[PDB]
């Protein structure tokens, strides 16, 4: 989702705990990663909508 390794200080710990607990699936993990501020910062803010 982020096109390269993300350092530990930027990884989202709450989704990861949710995922290894089985509360959410990989699809919901990917959704959490997409909806984070890191994604908006890297792949929405510097680009046009198209």
């Amino acid at each position: 989702v982020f096109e390269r390794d993300v350092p530990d200080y930027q990884r989202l710990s709450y989704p990861e705990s949710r995922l290894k607990n089985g509360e959410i699936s990989m699809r919901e993990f990917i959704r959490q990663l997409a909806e984070s501020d890191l994604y908006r910062k890297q792949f929405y803010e510097p680009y046009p909508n198209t």
Binding site: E45, P46, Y47, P48, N49, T50
Partner: protein, 162 residues
């Protein structure tokens, strides 16, 4: 994106300098304009629909063939795409005015837009005319002081497309 403060910080960081008297002057100027910018932003948000209403009305009055059969704004889909584009232009010009900088218009709007319209067949000159109409409508609502500053960013978009 960069706003005015970010731009000053950048121009002083790339040369390793602390802020000078000129930097603090620019920062005071932006903070002084802040209240006017906020008032204009609130007014435009309250009246975004109306601004698009009248801007599109007068653009299609000056260029009737756009909405008539054979024009690029002739079908409900293409007309809706056109007013959606005008919505983009108004919202991002308001962002740029509130920021005091034109960088958001560069990155989020103008980057590749001529390519997009060329591939779509959208007439760019008529889009510039729509932006000019939007300028005319917005300047009435925001008042002269805010009209000058907001017309700065409308003219930035018009110059970037033309």
């Amino acid at each position: 994106m960069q706003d005015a403060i970010t731009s000053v910080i950048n121009t002083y960081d790339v040369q390793g300098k602390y802020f000078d008297t000129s930097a603090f002057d620019k920062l005071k100027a932006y903070y002084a304009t802040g209240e006017l910018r906020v008032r204009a932003a609130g007014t435009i948000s309250a009246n975004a629909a109306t601004i698009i209403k009248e801007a599109s009305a007068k653009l299609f009055s000056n260029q009737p063939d756009l909405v008539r059969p054979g024009g690029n704004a002739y079908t409900t889909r293409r007309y809706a795409a056109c007013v959606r584009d005008m919505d983009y232009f108004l919202r991002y010009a308001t962002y740029a005015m509130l920021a005091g900088d034109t960088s958001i218009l560069d990155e989020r709007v103008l980057n590749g837009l001529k390519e997009t319209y060329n591939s779509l067949g959208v007439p760019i000159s008529s889009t510039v005319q729509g932006i000019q109409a939007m300028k005319e409508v917005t300047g009435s609502l925001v008042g002269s002081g805010a009209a000058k500053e907001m017309g700065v960013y409308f003219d930035y978009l018009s110059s970037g497309l033309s």
